[PDB]
Design a binder for this molecule. Structure first.
Ligand SMILES: [Cl-]
Length: 83
């Protein structure tokens, strides 16, 4: 079955998908990918046994949580403006 490392990798892959969609301005789908990747990164952090990996993943978690919050606010503003 999936190792801790496998959960971490799935989170990294989902965040990379989000980053790419973000760059492409596909903000709704980027937000969803950030959300899903961040859940895997939280699981990674809880079980990670390598201290360097844990420190790096924690920094990425905070970085992309903040970006996801920015996209969520942007999407909410767009919805309000369109109404
Ligand atoms: Cl997704």
């Amino acid at each position: 079955g999936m190792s801790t490392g496998d959960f971490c990798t799935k989170g990294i892959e989902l965040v990379q998908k989000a980053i790419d969609l973000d760059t492409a301005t596909q903000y709704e789908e980027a937000y969803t990918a950030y959300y899903n990747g961040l859940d895997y990164l939280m699981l990674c952090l809880k079980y990670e046994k390598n201290p360097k990996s844990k420190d790096l993943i924690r920094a990425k978690f905070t970085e992309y949580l903040n970006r996801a919050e920015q996209l969520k606010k942007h999407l909410e503003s767009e919805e309000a403006n369109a109404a």
